[PDB]
Design a protein around this ligand. Structure first.
Ligand SMILES: Cc1cc2nc3c(=O)[nH]c(=O)nc-3n(C[C@H](O)[C@H](O)[C@H](O)COP(=O)(O)O)c2cc1C
Ligand SMILES: *OP(=O)(O)OCC(C)(C)[C@@H](O)C(=O)NCCC(=O)NCCSC(=O)/C=C/C
Lengths: 845, 132, 163
């Protein structure tokens, strides 16, 4: 016996099978809910109204859960439990709420605020219905950690990620009130007690620190400039990180102990490190309020004493006006300089610091990447630096594609971080001695034995458990004055990294992802629910998800593209790469060369050797002349053999007979395996005609510049099932050439290229033997630039095969070619000026 | 590296390929050719990505790619070629694989495979409705 | 009214302006295809390929010849015909950006009735329409008729016709 209740919002509907015993109460609740629900609109784009049935059921859960009291037993207990159980069974197929929240964003038109409202309501419901998170979630990632197929490390961010950090604390107080309401009230009480206890704290906290009043009423929340000042921003960034931790612990059904013991290790960036050591002390929910109280008390005293040591003073209006007119930030005590090496930046700061006195000197403070540094000093000094830099940088929109690589003006961004104090600088040193007394007055000491997981120092990367001195004093020293070598500390082996830190997509996680792309390390942003389009780093949902979509491993290029050996039944050994696997021949090609491969006898002789070669269209001026060439190639090769055709693009009058020719010859079934276009990457449209109209196996493209590589990646993505053969040659190549270095563009673009499995990446230019190509096959070539290994699928030899027997090149020309000494890659660009190893660059026809 | 004149193109390319093989063998196979995996034929694999007597009933919903992969089986042999090679060769020309055209999945089609493990003995038998 | 065949200097200027995705005014006829394109050889060679398909025979080095000398060298052989490349450009302007039911022949009837423009002028009005193709499809018939009317006055301004 069950009378169904029909609950609606315009077009979208849901049906609840309410038992006949309690339907009286459910009909009242249905009426009241439908009265509160606003009048439906088209699309549902209007706020406070559901977009999907799942949201509506959420809003109902939320509405009921508001009325029910968690202590007193009302009549609404049974209707709440029944609509929860019905919502679970219908929408959360065993999976976690965040998995459904994610699914709605990437499928439906649901906005992010409506999703967060749903999650709030579902969690609120679950807690008010006396249904806590007792049972351990079956999270894929945490299952895989128990088994041993995943190693989790927890990283905690710091300052300089976002200017609007407090909204992250507002979103936690709103969305997860019933989980972290008790934490935030405890932290706000501890802070309020420290203000009174500390002799002169009211002086540094001008507008008070009543964080609860600022959470309830966004009208009483002070301006961003006050909030950002370190005596607030330090403890509150702690609170946000600990809250994201608790939320993660509660939704997984773990106590902080269990969640800590599932981590191989933890570390932090700046004041993050204070959290990471407090996390490592955690055992059970009863003893978590001492581990938080430590981390709040430390972050409070750091933030107070470091402000008393170098308080931010009014900047001259002229300086602020200049900075805004040059598209730079608002001068702060920390400046981020992207796309310059650490030597280059240290050269500039050494020049700037030569003219400045001791108490105004800048210094490199964060080493975030190879080419990502943060300089910390007085904001004027850093404006000084910023002027020296704006002199040296090229214009941002300047095209240098036609300038030789060495003569190119170095390009680099530089913006001020949103931060109020100069962390990791000499300016905060006087604070040190004051902090190390405030910790021993409030009996705040981190002991080695109480830390159960290794926590990595930000300076040298060594564990903090194996120190002789105080860990609290060493952490303070690591935050206030000692620099942060992020690459050095994150040298730990781990498949998964959880960015608890503030900043979401602009936080420490995404930075750490960029640092160790292609090593097979998945970063998961554990604080922010969102949809990644590229899906290269995870969000909140991946931690909770119970399906295969919970455990996503990032590609390790050395493993995904490791070159192997294989053999036929005939016992012939092949080098097995993405490229050779398609064509069933060694991954060595002779590219279309005018006039070396215009000869049908050379094309046939190379094909007969079992090696792929392009017939150069450049040596033909008519469909008949090129038909007679192809006919001659086909008469000289064994049955089943194939070759390809190279067409120049800087010769557009050839393509208008050559492309229709290939189309006609493929329609008669001529053994043309593939077409390569030299001297320019076609547009998306013409490339799409070449792909489907020509009936080739694969398309070859020879990008010249980064912009051209990007164009090839676009053509690949448009047709994800068609194999594209991205033939990359540097400017060091024979014949028409680019201005580009052979390595640099591959370092930038290799990651992006491997995101498209249909691209078969072939390296050309400057190759003669197996000795010089082996590093590119293995991928070890890219270790010399401190990148991870980046294996290549195959190789092309142009200049090398010009003196072969079967090449029509005249004996005296072959003697002239053999005479040319040639030069190493470092000295290739001299061909633009003078004869260099018997070679020179000229402007062609 | 252009030094030896009138070296045959085969000798140049083999010399690179064999150089790679000899380095790869030393580094990743403890210099022992017996540890190199063997296949019937090496090729055909697009870069995108144990039952003796099976049966397969096509429908109108049947996915063409999963259909063929199923008929072909896991082992690389004459069947795998027959069902996944997109092109075959008539003398020197290259024409659409006629086996794939013929097995193209449609309602009523029923593929019995027998001795699907021993590639020498494997018989694939397509049966369709003919007068009911 | 008077039926004069479409000028090659207008046709060439439209095809270049359509390819570079710039307003007809933004391309000066004095600048060369190599100067205009700004080092993007692939765009320059697609322009030379469009010109080669449109007219047929082209001068020795058309990328270094300014658009004037190139226009008058095409005009010496130019029969006045619409072209094959312009057939495809106008076919895909009408199919992709005009309302469903509003074909090329209905626009050729409308502009003939409204302005009294023969097939030689109507070619020119459709060509100047191509050089500033609207980003989205005109859903309403009256917006398509307001665009075609505005394009006629812009064509009339360029040639020097008074309606
Ligand atoms: C003599 C010669 C002729 C060439 N002809 C062409 C051609 O017609 N089309 C093309 O795309 N590339 C051509 N190239 C470039 C090669 O395809 C390839 O990029 C280059 O030779 C590889 O560099 P390497 O010669 O330093 O080994 C030619 C190269 C040489 C040396
Ligand atoms: O104007 P762009 O599109 O930039 O033209 C490309 C350009 C030829 C200038 C060059 O940078 C380039 O593409 N370099 C990469 C290597 C390449 O494509 N090599 C083959 C070119 S054709 C050739 O060698 C013909 C000789 C007769």
């Amino acid at each position: 016996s069950t009378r169904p209740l029909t609950l609606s919002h315009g077009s979208l509907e849901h049906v609840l099978l309410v038992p006949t015993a309690s339907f009286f109460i459910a009909s009242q609740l249905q009426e009241q809910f439908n009265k509160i629900l606003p009048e439906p609109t088209e699309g549902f784009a209007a706020d406070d109204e559901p977009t999907t049935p799942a949201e509506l059921v959420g809003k109902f859960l939320g509405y009921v859960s508001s009325l029910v009291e968690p202590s007193k037993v009302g009549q609404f207990d049974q209707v709440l439990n029944l609509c929860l159980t019905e919502f679970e069974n219908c929408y959360l197929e065993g999976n976690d709420i965040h998995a459904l929240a994610a699914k709605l964003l990437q499928e439906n038109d649901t906005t992010l605020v409506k999703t967060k409202e749903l999650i709030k309501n579902y969690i609120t419901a679950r807690i008010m219905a006396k249904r806590p998170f007792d049972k351990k979630s079956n999270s894929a990632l945490f299952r895989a950690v128990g088994e041993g197929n995943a190693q989790l490390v927890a990283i905690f961010g710091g300052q300089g990620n976002t200017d609007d950090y407090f909204e992250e604390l507002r979103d936690l107080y709103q969305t997860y009130h019933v989980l972290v309401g008790d934490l935030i009230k405890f932290s706000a009480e501890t802070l309020s007690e420290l203000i009174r206890t500390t002799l002169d704290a009211e002086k540094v906290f001008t507008q008070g620190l009543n964080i609860l009043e600022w959470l309830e009423n966004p009208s009483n929340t002070p301006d961003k400039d006050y909030l950002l000042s370190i005596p607030i921003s330090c403890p509150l960034i702690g609170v946000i990180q600990l809250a994201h931790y608790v939320v993660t612990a509660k939704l997984l059904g773990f106590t902080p102990g269990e969640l800590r013991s599932y981590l191989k290790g933890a570390t932090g960036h700046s004041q993050g490190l204070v959290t990471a050591v407090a996390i490592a002390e955690t055992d059970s929910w009863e003893s978590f309020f001492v581990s938080v109280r430590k981390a709040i008390t430390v972050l409070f005293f750091i933030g107070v004493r470091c402000y008393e040591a170098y308080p931010n003073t009014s900047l001259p209006p002229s300086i602020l006006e200049d900075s805004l007119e040059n598209n730079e930030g608002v001068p702060s005590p920390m400046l981020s300089i992207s796309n310059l090496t650490q030597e280059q930046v240290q050269d500039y700061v050494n020049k700037t610091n030569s003219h400045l006195p001791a108490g105004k000197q800048v210094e490199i403070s964060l080493v975030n990447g190879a080419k990502n540094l943060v300089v910390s000093g007085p904001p004027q000094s850093l404006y000084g630096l910023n002027l020296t830099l704006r002199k040296a940088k090229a214009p941002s929109g300047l095209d240098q594609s036609r300038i030789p690589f060495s003569e190119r003006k170095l390009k680099f961004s530089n913006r001020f971080l949103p931060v109020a104090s100069p962390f990791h600088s000499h300016l905060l040193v006087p604070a040190s001695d004051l902090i190390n007394k405030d910790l021993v007055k409030n009996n705040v000491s981190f002991n080695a034995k109480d830390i159960q997981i290794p926590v990595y120092d930000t300076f040298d990367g060594s564990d903090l458990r194996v120190l002789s001195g105080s860990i609290s004093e060493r952490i303070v020293d690591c935050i206030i004055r000692l620099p942060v070598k992020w690459e050095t500390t994150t040298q730990f082996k781990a498949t998964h990294i959880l960015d608890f830190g503030p900043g979401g997509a602009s936080g420490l996680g995404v930075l750490t992802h960029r640092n160790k792309d292609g090593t097979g390390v998945r970063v998961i942003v554990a604080g922010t629910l969102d949809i990644n389009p590229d899906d290269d780093y995870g969000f909140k949902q991946e931690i909770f998800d119970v399906t295969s979509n919970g455990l996503k491993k990032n590609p390790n290029w050395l493993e995904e593209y490791h070159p192997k050996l294989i053999k036929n039944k005939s016992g012939k050994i092949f080098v097995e790469t993405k490229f050779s696997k398609l064509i069933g021949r060694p991954p060595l090609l002779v590219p279309g060369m005018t006039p070396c491969t215009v000869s049908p006898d050379f094309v046939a002789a190379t094909t007969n050797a079992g090696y792929t070669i392009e017939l150069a269209g450049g040596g033909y001026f008519s469909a008949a002349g090129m038909t007679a060439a192809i006919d001659s190639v086909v008469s000289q090769i064994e049955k089943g053999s194939t070759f390809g055709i190279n067409l120049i693009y800087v010769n557009p009058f050839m393509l208008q007979w050559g492309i229709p020719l290939i189309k006609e010859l493929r329609s008669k079934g001529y053994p043309i395996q593939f077409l390569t276009i030299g001297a320019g990457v076609p547009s998306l449209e013409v490339a799409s005609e070449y792909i489907e109209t020509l009936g080739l196996k694969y398309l070859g493209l020879k990008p010249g510049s980064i912009d051209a590589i990007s164009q090839v990646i676009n053509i690949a993505k448009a047709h994800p099932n068609f194999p594209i053969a991205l033939q990359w040659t540097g400017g060091r190549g024979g014949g028409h050439h680019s201005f580009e270095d052979a390595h640099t563009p591959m370092l930038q673009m290799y990651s992006k290229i491997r995101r498209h499995p249909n691209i078969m990446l072939i390296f050309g230019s400057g190759f003669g033997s197996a000795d010089d190509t082996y590093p590119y096959l293995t991928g070890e070539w890219s270790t010399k630039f401190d990148y991870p290994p980046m294996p290549f699928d195959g190789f092309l030899f142009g200049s090398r095969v010009m003196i072969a027997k079967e090449v029509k090149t005249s004996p005296d020309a072959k003697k002239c070619i053999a005479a040319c000494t040639g030069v190493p890659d470092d000295k290739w660009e001299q061909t633009y000026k003078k004869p260099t190893g018997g070679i020179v660059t000229v402007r062609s026809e | 590296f252009t030094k030896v004149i009138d070296e045959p193109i085969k000798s140049i390319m083999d010399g690179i390929h064999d150089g790679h093989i000899k380095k790869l063998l030393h580094q990743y196979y403890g210099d022992d050719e017996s540890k190199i995996p063997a296949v019937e034929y090496f090729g055909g694999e697009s870069p995108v990505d144990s039952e003796d007597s099976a049966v397969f009933k096509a429908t109108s919903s049947t996915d063409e790619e999963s259909w063929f992969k199923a008929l072909a089986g896991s082992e690389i042999n004459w069947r795998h070629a027959s069902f996944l090679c997109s092109f075959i060769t008539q003398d020197k020309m290259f024409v659409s694989n006629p086996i794939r055209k013929v097995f193209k999945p449609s309602q009523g089609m029923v593929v019995e495979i027998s001795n699907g493990n021993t590639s020498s003995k494997t018989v694939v038998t397509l049966s369709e409705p003919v007068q009911g | 009214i008077a039926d004069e065949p479409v000028k090659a200097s207008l046709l060439l200027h439209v095809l270049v302006a359509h390819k570079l995705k710039k307003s007809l005014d933004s391309i000066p006829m004095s600048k060369t295809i190599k100067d205009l394109v700004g080092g993007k050889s692939t765009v320059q060679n697609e322009i030379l390929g469009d010109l080669g398909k449109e007219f047929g025979t082209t001068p020795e080095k058309p990328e270094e010849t300014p658009l004037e000398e190139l226009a008058e060298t095409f005009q010496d052989t130019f029969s006045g015909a619409l072209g094959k490349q312009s057939s495809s450009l106008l076919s895909r302007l009408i199919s992709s950006k005009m309302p469903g039911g509003f074909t090329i022949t209905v626009a050729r009837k409308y502009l003939q009735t409204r302005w009294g423009l023969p097939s030689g002028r109507q070619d020119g009005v459709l060509l100047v329409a191509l050089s500033n193709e609207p980003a989205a499809r005109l859903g309403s018939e009256a917006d398509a008729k307001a665009f075609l009317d505005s394009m006629a006055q812009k064509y009339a301004s360029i040639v020097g016709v008074d309606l």
